[PDB]
Design an enzyme around this catalytic site. Structure first.
Site, short mmCIF file in Angstrom:
data_model
loop_
_atom_site.label_atom_id
_atom_site.label_comp_id
_atom_site.label_asym_id
_atom_site.label_seq_id
_atom_site.Cartn_x
_atom_site.Cartn_y
_atom_site.Cartn_z
N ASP A 171 0.80 -1.07 0.01
CA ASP A 171 0.10 0.05 -0.20
C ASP A 171 0.94 1.15 0.16
O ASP A 171 2.15 1.14 -0.21
CB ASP A 171 -0.92 0.09 1.10
CG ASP A 171 -2.28 0.64 0.96
OD1 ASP A 171 -2.33 1.89 0.90
OD2 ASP A 171 -3.21 -0.21 0.83
N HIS A 210 -2.98 3.77 -3.77
CA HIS A 210 -2.58 2.98 -2.69
C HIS A 210 -1.22 2.37 -2.97
O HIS A 210 -0.96 1.39 -2.79
CB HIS A 210 -3.53 1.74 -2.23
CG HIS A 210 -4.67 2.17 -1.60
ND1 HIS A 210 -4.89 2.46 -0.19
CD2 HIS A 210 -5.93 2.54 -2.17
CE1 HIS A 210 -5.96 2.75 -0.22
NE2 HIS A 210 -6.82 2.71 -1.09
N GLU A 256 -10.54 3.46 -4.56
CA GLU A 256 -10.37 4.77 -4.18
C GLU A 256 -9.39 5.59 -4.93
O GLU A 256 -8.53 6.26 -4.41
CB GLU A 256 -9.80 4.85 -2.65
CG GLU A 256 -10.81 4.11 -1.88
CD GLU A 256 -10.51 4.27 -0.33
OE1 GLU A 256 -9.09 4.08 -0.02
OE2 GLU A 256 -11.25 4.42 0.45
C1 LIG Z 1 -11.18 -1.36 -0.20
C2 LIG Z 1 -11.16 -0.26 1.10
N1 LIG Z 1 -11.76 -0.66 2.38
N2 LIG Z 1 -11.37 0.50 3.17
C3 LIG Z 1 -10.82 1.55 2.83
C4 LIG Z 1 -10.35 2.89 3.56
N3 LIG Z 1 -10.86 4.02 3.20
C5 LIG Z 1 -12.12 4.39 3.76
C6 LIG Z 1 -12.87 5.75 3.46
N4 LIG Z 1 -13.95 6.09 3.95
C7 LIG Z 1 -14.12 6.97 4.83
O1 LIG Z 1 -12.85 7.39 5.34
C8 LIG Z 1 -15.32 7.52 5.67
C9 LIG Z 1 -15.37 8.52 6.68
C10 LIG Z 1 -16.50 9.04 7.42
C11 LIG Z 1 -17.83 8.28 6.99
C12 LIG Z 1 -17.87 7.53 5.87
C13 LIG Z 1 -19.08 6.76 5.25
N5 LIG Z 1 -20.27 7.37 5.69
C14 LIG Z 1 -20.64 6.64 6.85
C15 LIG Z 1 -21.07 8.44 5.41
C16 LIG Z 1 -18.89 5.75 4.25
C17 LIG Z 1 -18.02 5.40 3.74
C18 LIG Z 1 -16.70 6.25 4.22
C19 LIG Z 1 -16.64 7.07 5.08
C20 LIG Z 1 -15.43 5.71 3.44
O2 LIG Z 1 -15.14 4.59 2.34
S1 LIG Z 1 -10.23 1.29 1.04
#
Ligand SMILES: Cc1nnc(CNCCN2C(=O)c3cccc4c(N(C)C)ccc(c34)C2=O)s1
Ligand SMILES: *[C@@H]1O[C@H](CO)[C@@H](O)[C@H](O)[C@H]1NC(C)=O
Ligand SMILES: *[C@@H]1O[C@H](CO)[C@@H](O)[C@H](O)[C@H]1NC(C)=O
EC number: 3.2.1.52
Length: 572
Positions: free
Chosen positions: A227, A281, A346
């Site tokens: 990553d 990543h 992402e």
């Molecule tokens: C494949 C992957 N699995 N996990 C990864 C880590 N990045 C996560 C990013 N991320 C957030 O940082 C995040 C922060 C606050 C609220 C939310 C959210 N809501 C409850 C509205 C829905 C999705 C995410 C999110 C979301 O996807 S990449």
């Protein structure tokens, strides 16, 4: 001293009673009572077919267990290793510091592998088995495991070892006397994702993890090995990636270490599935190549989801030469996997658009600089990387990508096809994308973040408060999360599921607690798809936790041990 209590079954609950001396009824130890009071005894996962455990236990001599392999073939090495491990498995019934009296019947274990040459992992592999236990003569026990392949056979040995119980009132090792079991998993992909780039995990801890997976018949370790934070994978062809990218020279995974892990998995029916996440990543390791953009870009919130930012530059031809070498080095040591995971989570349009070289490239081919145009750049990247992956593995093989902007069902077929790509889902289980993808014929691996993200719940790692997907997901919620319910009529397109341990806040020290016993909840859900809910599995879950601890796993604690000894008194 000595145990002073006994247990009796009453309406499906083992109630603790004093073991009074003035009684002609033989006392039952706790786990002996549980074995018959519970619908499925101490089994985890419970079988999907016949589950007949009879009514009696027989006393067993621990030193008189003999395993016999009846059909020889290419899997001789694997079957013999599995057979030799059986005694240790049985011994897990005995708590540390306790010793069984060496008396009782001898046990003949007969292994029948109907296709002893099959040892390849595949989505179509046969993991079914039949298990029969019956008295043999006056002083022997006959356990016969019949399976279509080594993998089903290995599952059978696991189940068989769970049919032993230690009587700590008498110090007797006991075994279920009359057993008829037929069993096979509902889903072929039953996995754990381990992120070893956000933090390093000792290979000892990775193998330990594989031991626990096999104990509950999980069959896939998804190794998220790179990553943006680090590059611990030792690529012989592009050595600067790990030299610059590793957190330290000792925090790497050599070819020898990976081969060890992969073989360790194979022996235990666990596919070790590598992931190279791209084109986002990436970061550490790629310094001085000019093949990334936005590495450590600030302010990070403007360019990526979490620091450090960093993405591959798809416009550089040399990139695909690097990719081809990485994939080739991965294919060399991850040589049991039938599937390759290529990430695809992402991607930041803002990151790609801050690059001059990238903007020129998109002008020169007459794309614009708006959001939909970068999807074309991503498509360009994935097509070229995909071709390199096929070349590396020497064949076309299924590829996995996360749900993302690219895999939006509305236009996914512009970019991919359902025969070549499997989609790993981390949206909620009620997100419309799931139904959309299924309707287009795509296969899914369920890792929905509201039930399967095992990293959720702890403190924030940037700023204060709690991490993004809090609250912490209890095993109850993991257990009740059903792909069958999520997919409905399109069930068969669901290959299974995977618990995700992202490692921003997890490493060697926390791994046993993050995974266990919660991953066991997923194990039963994926193996059996029970119509019933967590409450009906509660007692067996408390026992499987104790078995993990006996294995040396530092598993999370679910309830006071008092509840385990006093079924029915802890409820809400
Ligand atoms: C494949 C992957 N699995 N996990 C990864 C880590 N990045 C996560 C990013 N991320 C957030 O940082 C995040 C922060 C606050 C609220 C939310 C959210 N809501 C409850 C509205 C829905 C999705 C995410 C999110 C979301 O996807 S990449
Ligand atoms: C052992 O039990 C199996 C299972 O029913 C039976 O088929 C097999 O013939 C028995 N073998 C011996 C030695 O009794
Ligand atoms: C990329 O940057 C250019 C300005 O240099 C801007 O015109 C374009 O809108 C940007 N595209 C996106 C998707 O931000």
């Amino acid at each position: 001293e000595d145990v002073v209590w006994r247990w009796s079954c009453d309406n499906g609950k083992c109630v603790k009673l004093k073991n009074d001396p003035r009684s002609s009824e033989p006392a039952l130890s706790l786990e002996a009572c549980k074995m018959f009071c519970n619908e499925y005894g101490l089994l985890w996962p419970r079988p999907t077919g016949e589950a007949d455990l009879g009514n009696f236990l027989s006393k067993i001599n621990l030193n008189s267990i003999e395993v016999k392999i009846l059909k020889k073939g290419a899997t001789d090495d694997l079957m013999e290793a599995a057979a030799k491990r059986f005694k240790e498995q049985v011994s897990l019934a005995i708590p540390r510091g306790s010793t069984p009296k060496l008396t009782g019947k001898a046990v003949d274990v007969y292994l029948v592998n109907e296709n002893p040459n099959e040892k390849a992992f595949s989505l179509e592999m046969d993991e079914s088995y039949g298990l029969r236990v019956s008295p043999s003569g006056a002083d022997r026990v006959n356990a016969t495991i019949t399976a279509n392949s080594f993998f089903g056979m290995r599952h059978g040995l696991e189940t068989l070892s769970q049919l032993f119980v230690f009587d700590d009132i008498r110090d007797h090792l006991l075994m279920v006397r009359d057993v008829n079991i037929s069993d096979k998993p509902v889903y072929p992909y039953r996995g754990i994702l381990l992120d070893t780039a956000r933090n390093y995990y000792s290979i000892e801890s990775i193998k330990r993890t594989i031991e626990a997976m096999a104990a509950v018949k999980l069959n896939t370790l998804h190794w998220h090995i790179t990553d943006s934070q680090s590059f611990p994978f030792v690529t012989t062809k592009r050595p600067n990636l790990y030299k610059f990218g590793a957190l330290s020279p000792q925090k790497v995974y050599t070819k020898a270490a990976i081969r060890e892990v992969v073989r360790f998995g194979l022996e235990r029916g666990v596919r070790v599935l590598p992931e190279f996440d791209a084109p986002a990543h990436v970061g550490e390791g790629w310094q001085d190549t000019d093949l990334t953009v936005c590495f450590k870009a600030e302010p990070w919130k403007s360019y990526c989801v979490e620091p450090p930012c960093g993405q591959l530059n798809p416009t550089k031809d040399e990139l695909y030469q690097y990719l081809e070498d990485i994939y080739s080095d991965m294919a060399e040591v991850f040589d049991t996997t039938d599937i390759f995971h290529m990430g695809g989570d992402e991607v930041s349009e803002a990151c790609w658009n801050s690059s001059d070289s990238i903007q020129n490239f998109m002008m020169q081919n007459r794309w614009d600089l708006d959001k939909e145009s970068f999807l074309k750049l991503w498509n360009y990247f994935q097509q070229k990387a995909q071709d390199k992956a096929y070349k590396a593995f020497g064949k076309k093989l299924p590829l996995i990508l996360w749900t993302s902007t690219l895999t939006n069902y509305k236009h996914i077929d512009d970019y991919l096809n359902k025969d070549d790509y499997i989609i790993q889902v981390w949206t909620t289980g009620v997100d419309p994308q799931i139904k959309g993808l299924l309707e287009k014929g795509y296969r899914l691996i369920m890792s929905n973040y509201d039930a399967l993200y095992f990293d959720c719940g702890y403190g924030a790692w940037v700023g204060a408060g709690n991490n993004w997907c809090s609250p912490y997901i209890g095993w109850q919620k993991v257990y009740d999360n059903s792909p069958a319910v999520i997919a409905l009529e399109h069930r068969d397109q669901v290959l299974g599921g995977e618990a995700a341990l992202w490692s921003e806040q997890s490493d060697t020290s926390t791994l046993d607690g993050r995974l266990w016993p919660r991953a066991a909840a997923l194990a039963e859900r994926l193996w059996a798809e029970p119509a019933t809910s967590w409450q009906d599995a509660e007692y067996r879950m408390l026992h499987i936790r104790e078995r993990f601890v006996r294995m040396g796993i530092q598993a999370e604690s679910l309830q006071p041990e008092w509840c385990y000894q006093n079924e029915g008194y802890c409820y809400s």
